[PDB]
Amino acid sequence: GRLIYTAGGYFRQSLSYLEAYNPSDGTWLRLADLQVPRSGLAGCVVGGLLYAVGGRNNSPDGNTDSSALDCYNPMTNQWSPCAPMSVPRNRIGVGVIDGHIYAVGGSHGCIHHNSVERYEPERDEWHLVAPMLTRRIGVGVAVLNRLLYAVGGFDGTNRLNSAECYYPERNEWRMITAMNTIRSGAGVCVLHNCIYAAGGYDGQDQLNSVERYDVATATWTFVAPMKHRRSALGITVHQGRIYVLGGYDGHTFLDSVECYDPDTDTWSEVTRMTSGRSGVGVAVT
Ligand SMILES: COc1ccc(S(=O)(=O)Nc2ccc(N(CC(=O)O)S(=O)(=O)c3ccc(OC)cc3)c3ccccc23)cc1
Ligand code: NA
Ligand code: NA
Numbered sequence: 068g069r070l071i072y073t074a075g076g077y078f079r080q081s082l083s084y085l086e087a088y089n090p091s092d093g094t095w096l097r098l099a100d101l102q103v104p105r106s107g108l109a110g111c112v113v114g115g116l117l118y119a120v121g122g123r124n125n126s127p128d129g130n131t132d133s134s135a136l137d138c139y140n141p142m143t144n145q146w147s148p149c150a151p152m153s154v155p156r157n158r159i160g161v162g163v164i165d166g167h168i169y170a171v172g173g174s175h176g177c178i179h180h181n182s183v184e185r186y187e188p189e190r191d192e193w194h195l196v197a198p199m200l201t202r203r204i205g206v207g208v209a210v211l212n213r214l215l216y217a218v219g220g221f222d223g224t225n226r227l228n229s230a231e232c233y234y235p236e237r238n239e240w241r242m243i244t245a246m247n248t249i250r251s252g253a254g255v256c257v258l259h260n261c262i263y264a265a266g267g268y269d270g271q272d273q274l275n276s277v278e279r280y281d282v283a284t285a286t287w288t289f290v291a292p293m294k295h296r297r298s299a300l301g302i303t304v305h306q307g308r309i310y311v312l313g314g315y316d317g318h319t320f321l322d323s324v325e326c327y328d329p330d331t332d333t334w335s336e337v338t339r340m341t342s343g344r345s346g347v348g349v350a351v352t
C-alpha cells in the first residue's frame with residue numbers, strides 16, 4: 068500500500084498542496100498543506116518520511132527561492148521544518164543514497180549551481196560534497212547501485228544533453244554518455260537497472276520522447292513516447308511502472324498522469340490530478 072505523493076507545484080502561483088495517489092484503488096488523498104508554497108522543488112523519502120527540498124515561491128507579491136527542507140510524517144499528517152540547505156536551490160534535483168539526501172544543482176536568482184550538498188537526517192545537518200562537473204538547473208536525478216546520476220538541465224547558457232555520475236565513497240563525479248536529446252526539466256527515474264529521462268524542454272519545444280540509459284552498456288535508447296509533451300513534470304516508479312504527473316506542455320498546465328509499462332513498452336492514462344500543475348516534487352512511501 069505505498070502511495071505516490073505530490074507536493075507543491077505551480078498553477079498561477081506556487082502551490083501548497085500535498086496529495087497522494089493510490090494506484091491500487093485509484094484514489095487521491097488530500098493531506099496537510101506545505102507551510103510555505105513552492106514550485107521547482109524535489110521530493111524524496113528516507114525511513115518512511117517524505118522530504119520537500121528547495122524550489123521557489125512564485126507569487127503575485129514577489130518571487131523567493133527556497134533553501135528549505137521540510138519533513139512530512141504520513142502517520143501524523145504534519146510537516147516539520149529541518150535544517151535549511153547552504154543556499155537556495157530552485158529547479159533542484161534530489162536523490163537518496165544510504166539514508167542521506169543529496170541536493171544537486173538548481174538556481175538562486177541568476178546563479179546556476181554546480182554545487183551539491185548532503186543531508187543526514189540523524190544529525191539534521193547539511194554539508195557540501197564534490198561539485199558536479201557542470202552547472203545544472205532543471206536537472207533530473209536518480210540513484211542506481213549506490214551511484215547518483217545527474218541528467219540534463221541548463222547551465223545558464225546551454226540546455227544540456229549531458230549527464231554525470233557521482234561516486235559517494237570516492238566523493239567524485241564522472242561524465243557519462245550524453246543523451247540522444249537535449250532536455251531541461253525532464254522527469255528522471257530508475258527502473259530495472261536503467262535511468263529513464265522522460266519529456267522536458269529542448270530549448271525550442273516541450274518533449275514527449277523518453278529515453279533510458281542502460282548502465283551496463285553506457286547507452287541511451289528511446290522507448291515509446293508519452294502521449295503528452297511536458298516539461299517540469301513529476302515522476303516516480305511504483306510497482307515496476309513509471310508514473311509521470313502534470314507538467315507544462317507549452318500552452319497548458321497538465322492534470323494528466325501517464326503510466327509506462329516496461330513489459331509492453333506502452334504508456335497509458337491512469338488518472339488525473341485534482342488540478343493541472345507543473346514543477347511538483349514526487350516520491351513514494
Ligand atoms: C520557455 O523557456 C523554458 C521553458 C521550459 C523550461 S523547463 O521546464 O525546462 N525548466 C523550468 C522552468 C520553470 C519552472 N518553474 C518555475 C520557475 O522556476 O520560475 S514551474 O514548474 O513552477 C513553471 C512556472 C511557470 C511556467 O510557465 C509556463 C512553467 C513552469 C521549472 C520547475 C521545475 C523544473 C524546471 C522548470 C525552461 C525554459
Ligand atoms: Na551544515
Ligand atoms: Na525523484
Ligand code: NA
Nearest residue numbers: 340341342343
Ligand atoms: Na480538475
